């Protein structure tokens, strides 16, 4: 029982693991009434 990692994982193999971990910026649309940026299909923070 109790598995365990057999070798310290190298810097390259953990950073390769992380090749998917990056964020994607929020998808935003200009607000028709106000000037500002709003995420679509949601109610405008300014000028509801």
Partner 1 sequence: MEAKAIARYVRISPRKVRLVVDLIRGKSLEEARNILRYTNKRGAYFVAKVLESAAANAVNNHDMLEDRLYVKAAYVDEGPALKRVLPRARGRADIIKKRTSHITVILGEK
Partner 2 sequence: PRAKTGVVRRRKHKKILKLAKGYWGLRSKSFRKARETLFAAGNYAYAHRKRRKRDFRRLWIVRINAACRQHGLNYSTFIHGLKKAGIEVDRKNLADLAVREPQVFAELVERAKAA
Residue 26 or 32: the one with the smaller Cβ distance to partner 1 is: 26
Residues 8, 20, 21, 41: which binds RNA (CB under 7 A)?
A: 8
CA atoms lying within 13 Å on the CB side of residue 41: 1
41 binds partner 1 (CB under 8 A): no
Give just the sign of the alpha carbon dihedral 14, 16, 17, 22.
Answer: positive
CA atoms lying within 13 Å on the CB side of residue 25: 2
> Under rule CB under 8 A, which residues in 4-33 are in contact with partner 2?
10-12
11 binds RNA (CB under 7 A): yes
Task: Give the footprint of partner 2 on this chain (CB under 8 A).
Answer: 10-12
């Amino acid at each position: 029982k109790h598995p365990v990692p057999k070798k310290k994982t190298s810097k390259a193999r953990r950073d390769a693991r992380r090749s998917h971990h990056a964020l994607t910026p929020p998808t935003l649309v200009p607000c028709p009434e106000c000037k500002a940026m709003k995420p679509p299909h949601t109610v405008c923070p300014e000028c509801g």
